Amino acid sequence: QEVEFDIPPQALGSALQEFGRQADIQVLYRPEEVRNKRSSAIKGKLEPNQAITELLRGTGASVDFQGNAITISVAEAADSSVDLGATMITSNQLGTITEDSGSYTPGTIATATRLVLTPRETPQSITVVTRQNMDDFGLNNIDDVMRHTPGITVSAYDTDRNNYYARGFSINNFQYDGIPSTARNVGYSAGNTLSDMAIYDRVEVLKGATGLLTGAGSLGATINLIRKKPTHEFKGHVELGAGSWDNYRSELDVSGPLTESGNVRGRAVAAYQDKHSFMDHYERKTSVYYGILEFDLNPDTMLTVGADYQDNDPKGSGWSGSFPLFDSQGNRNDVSRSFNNGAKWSSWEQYTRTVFANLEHNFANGWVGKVQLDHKINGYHAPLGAIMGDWPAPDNSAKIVAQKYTGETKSNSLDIYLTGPFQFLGREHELVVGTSASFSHWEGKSYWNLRNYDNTTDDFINWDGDIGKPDWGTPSQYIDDKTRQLGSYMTARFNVTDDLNLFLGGRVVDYRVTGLNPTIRESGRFIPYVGAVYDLNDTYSVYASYTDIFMPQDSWYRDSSNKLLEPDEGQNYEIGIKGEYLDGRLNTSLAYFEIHEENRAEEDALYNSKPTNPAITYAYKGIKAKTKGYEAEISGELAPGWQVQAGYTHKIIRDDSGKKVSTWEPQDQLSLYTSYKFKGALDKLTVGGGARWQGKSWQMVYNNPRSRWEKFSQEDYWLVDLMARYQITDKLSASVNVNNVFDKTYYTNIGFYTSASYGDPRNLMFSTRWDF
Ligand SMILES: CCCCCCCCOCCOCCOCCOCCOCCO
Numbered sequence: 001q002e003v004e005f006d007i008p009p010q011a012l013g014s015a016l017q018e019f020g021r022q023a024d025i026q027v028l029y030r031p032e033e034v035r036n037k038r039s040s041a042i043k044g045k046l047e048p049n050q051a052i053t054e055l056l057r058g059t060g061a062s063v064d065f066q067g068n069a070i071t072i073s074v075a076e077a078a079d080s081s082v083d084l085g086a087t088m089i090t091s092n093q094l095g096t097i098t099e100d101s102g103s104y105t106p107g108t109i110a111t112a113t114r115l116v117l118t119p120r121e122t123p124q125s126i127t128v129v130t131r132q133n134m135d136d137f138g139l140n141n142i143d144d145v146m147r148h149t150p151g152i153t154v155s156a157y158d159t160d161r162n163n164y165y166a167r168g169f170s171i172n173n174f175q176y177d178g179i180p181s182t183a184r185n186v187g188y189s190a191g192n193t194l195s196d197m198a199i200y201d202r203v204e205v206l207k208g209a210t211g212l213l214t215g216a217g218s219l220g221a222t223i224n225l226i227r228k229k230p231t232h233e234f235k236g237h238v239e240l241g242a243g244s245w246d247n248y249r250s251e252l253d254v255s256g257p258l259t260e261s262g263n264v265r266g267r268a269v270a271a272y273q274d275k276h277s278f279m280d281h282y283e284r285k286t287s288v289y290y291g292i293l294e295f296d297l298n299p300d301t302m303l304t305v306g307a308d309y310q311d312n313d314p315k316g317s318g319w320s321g322s323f324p325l326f327d328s329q330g331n332r333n334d335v336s337r338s339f340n341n342g343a344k345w346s347s348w349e350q351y352t353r354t355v356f357a358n359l360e361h362n363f364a365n366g367w368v369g370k371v372q373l374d375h376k377i378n379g380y381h382a383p384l385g386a387i388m389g390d391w392p393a394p395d396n397s398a399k400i401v402a403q404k405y406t407g408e409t410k411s412n413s414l415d416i417y418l419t420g421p422f423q424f425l426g427r428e429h430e431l432v433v434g435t436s437a438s439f440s441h442w443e444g445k446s447y448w449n450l451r452n453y454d455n456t457t458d459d460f461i462n463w464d465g466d467i468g469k470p471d472w473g474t475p476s477q478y479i480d481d482k483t484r485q486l487g488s489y490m491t492a493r494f495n496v497t498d499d500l501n502l503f504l505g506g507r508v509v510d511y512r513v514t515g516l517n518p519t520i521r522e523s524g525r526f527i528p529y530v531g532a533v534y535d536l537n538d539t540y541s542v543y544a545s546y547t548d549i550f551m552p553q554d555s556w557y558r559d560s561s562n563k564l565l566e567p568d569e570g571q572n573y574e575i576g577i578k579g580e581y582l583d584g585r586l587n588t589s590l591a592y593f594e595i596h597e598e599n600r601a602e603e604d605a606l607y608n609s610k611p612t613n614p615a616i617t618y619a620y621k622g623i624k625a626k627t628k629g630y631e632a633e634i635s636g637e638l639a640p641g642w643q644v645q646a647g648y649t650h651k652i653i654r655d656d657s658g659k660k661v662s663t664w665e666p667q668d669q670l671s672l673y674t675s676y677k678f679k680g681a682l683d684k685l686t687v688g689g690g691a692r693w694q695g696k697s698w699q700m701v702y703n704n705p706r707s708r709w710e711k712f713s714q715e716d717y718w719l720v721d722l723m724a725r726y727q728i729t730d731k732l733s734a735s736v737n738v739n740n741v742f743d744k745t746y747y748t749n750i751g752f753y754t755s756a757s758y759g760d761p762r763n764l765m766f767s768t769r770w771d772f
């Protein structure tokens with residue numbers, strides 16, 4: 001619909017870059033094709049497709065409309081066969097925005113290499129949860145989104161922290177607009193498990209080994225969250241929602257030009273949610289604010305400054321799971337799903353805020369440069385108190401453990417990169433070169449010396465959280481931890497033939513961890529990157545990649561000799577086929593992958609059964625482990641009103657001995673989510689449902705009162721979701737979500753400190769959205 005335009009005649013390149021900007025649309029185009037071509041003047045209020053055909057008059061070019069993207073091409077009478085993976089330069093460095101796309105499949109994406117590429121072009125497993133998916137299914141935070149992510153298993157630590165698995169591993173890499181955060185441990189990463197979705201366009205998850213742009217981090221995956229950006233036309237909405245257990249949410253999102261010319265633009269969002277829960281005496285208030293402003297210093301240089309903020313604030317938090325597995329005498333414990341071992345006053349409140357600036361420049365090259373500046377705070381305030389141990393006892397009494405952690409982490413980042421195309425042996429390739437620097441500083445206080453507390457409670461079966469609050473006494477410990485990451489990376493994408501694209505690059509990395517432990521250094525570590533994509537027909541391509549990552553170990557992962565273990569590394573080997581249909585409106589992939597891990601910290605039983613060095617009382621051993629598995633997924637349009645996203649993943653991970661590890665992540669999983677928009681008489685009704693299935697999962701846990709190990713099993717289970725929206729009016733709509741339709745009662749944790757958490761019972765959410 002109609003937009004304000006001002007692009008005067010220039011290099012086709014600038015014109016195109018300037019166009020994507022002015023129109024809020026990603027423009028893809030081939031450097032060698034637009035070289036030495038000229039745009040025609042365009043001036044004023046016009047629809048974006050009249051505008052672009054006017055712009056290209058003279059140039060001999062054609063436009064392919066594809067949702068939030070246009071690709072531009074210049075056909076010849078010649079053409080000796082087609083280069084589907086031709087080097088394309090893009091106008092939006094983070095890829096195609098998903099908001100308003102109507103789709104559950106993404107557009108282009110730079111998650112793997114910083115190069116803007118399509119899921120077909122990307123030689124790695126890349127799953128995206130798109131803005132619309134989030135809207136239809138009510139996914140309001142990162143916990144909701146992960147639960148709907150193909151290939152991801154979400155399990156509980158406690159009411160205020162979950163765990164995310166891919167391919168054998170706990171995910172511990174998070175980025176924001178492509179900037180890695182520091183996530184070493186939970187001090188550094190307060191609120192990462194809790195980010196509200198209000199401020200994001202999409203969440204994009206790279207599976208495998210992602211050292212190339214994460215730098216130091218875990219195996220499994222990266223989770224990359226893209227912030228919502230401001231726009232050239234005014235728009236926004238208000239949303240109010242109401243669900244099971246006194247769950248009320250509201251949300252305001254406003255976007256547009258702040259000056260008559262359009263050269264300064266803004267976007268602002270606020271969202272507030274106060275909820276109780278099926279679990280007894282647990283409530284949680286969350287608040288978020290976000291502001292970003294964009295300044296055009298001139299048509300090819302943009303300055304962006306922004307801030308965001310989220311406060312997660314519960315009552316009735318627990319330390320570890322919702323209740324203890326065994327009682328005092330060693331019998332399995334059996335409780336209601338409402339049972340909550342946390343105390344009334346108990347809280348794991350977690351906060352986060354960012355201030356950021358970026359500057360981005362288009363070189364008259366076709367090259368583009370970008371500087372990214374970040375100040376992040378991850379903070380927490382955690383007076384935890386919760387029933388813990390082998391309780392109840394024969395007389396129905398129980399004991400509380402109560403400790404208090406408060407603290408803050410402040411992080412600063414610089415990220416700078418150059419991206420452009422270049423000719424080598426008569427053909428067009430592209431390159432990213434970039435360097436990065438991060439400094440983050442965790443500080444905190446711990447309280448465990450309680451003064452004159454009586455931690456028994458007389459009644460377990462009817463626990464209510466209604467116990468007194470202790471005197472924390474004086475700080476037991478002072479934390480001070482500084483991490484410093486310096487990175488340098490270079491990926492090159494060579495168009496070798498019309499069907500074959502070769503990827504060659506890597507990162508060089510320097511990582512120093514400093515503070516109250518002995519210094520942990522790693523100078524000059526190289527992380528390689530090898531990939532190739534071979535096109536088979538207009539539909540299918542095959543691909544292969546070899547990818548790496550490592551994480552220098554926590555300071556207490558030492559050995560026999562009191563030496564820190566060499567860093568936990570892994571390599572992903574992946575071969576696959578990916579298929580693209582309806583001009584990129586539908587994507588399919590089947591992959592086979594293998595993860596080789598080396599130096600995975602293992603216990604060391606023989607030593608630990610009777611230590612011989614008081615400096616390490618619990619030494620480890622650095623071992624090896626293997627993931628073998630395969631994954632299939634599909635997303636996009638199955639038919640005109642009909643969208644899906646679905647996947648299927650199979651895995652087993654062992655260590656070189658042979659034992660199955662991460663046995664709680666299931667060996668087989670399946671997700672399918674779908675909605676359908678009726679046409680004709682019912683064209684204002686959208687209907688939707690979904691299912692998630694997973695196979696057996698187990699833990700080995702020690703029954704201390706009976707001095708024997710036990711196996712705990714969660715039998716495979718289905719969860720079914722349902723959904724309907726009705727657009728009553730141009731500007732107002734009403735929705736309902738029903739989750740866990742058949743009220744399946746299942747577990748999300750067994751064995752985490754000898755405890756258990758139930759997943760959500762059936763729940764509903766009502767809401768109205770109002771678009772101005
Ligand atoms: C040192 C920290 C920097 C803080 C940066 C925070 C940025 C906050 O800015 C708020 C911007 O909100 C823009 C909202 O856009 C509203 C668009 O409508 C404009 C009014 O409409 C004009 C008449 O239709």
Ligand SMILES: CCCCCCCCOCCOCCOCCOCCOCCO
Pocket residue numbers: 734735736738743762763764766767768
């Ligand atoms: C353990 C028990 C769980 C409860 C299960 C109940 C499931 C019942 O599902 C029925 C849902 O249908 C209700 C239809 O209500 C209409 C929605 O209208 C929205 C109003 O919008 C306001 C506009 O301003």
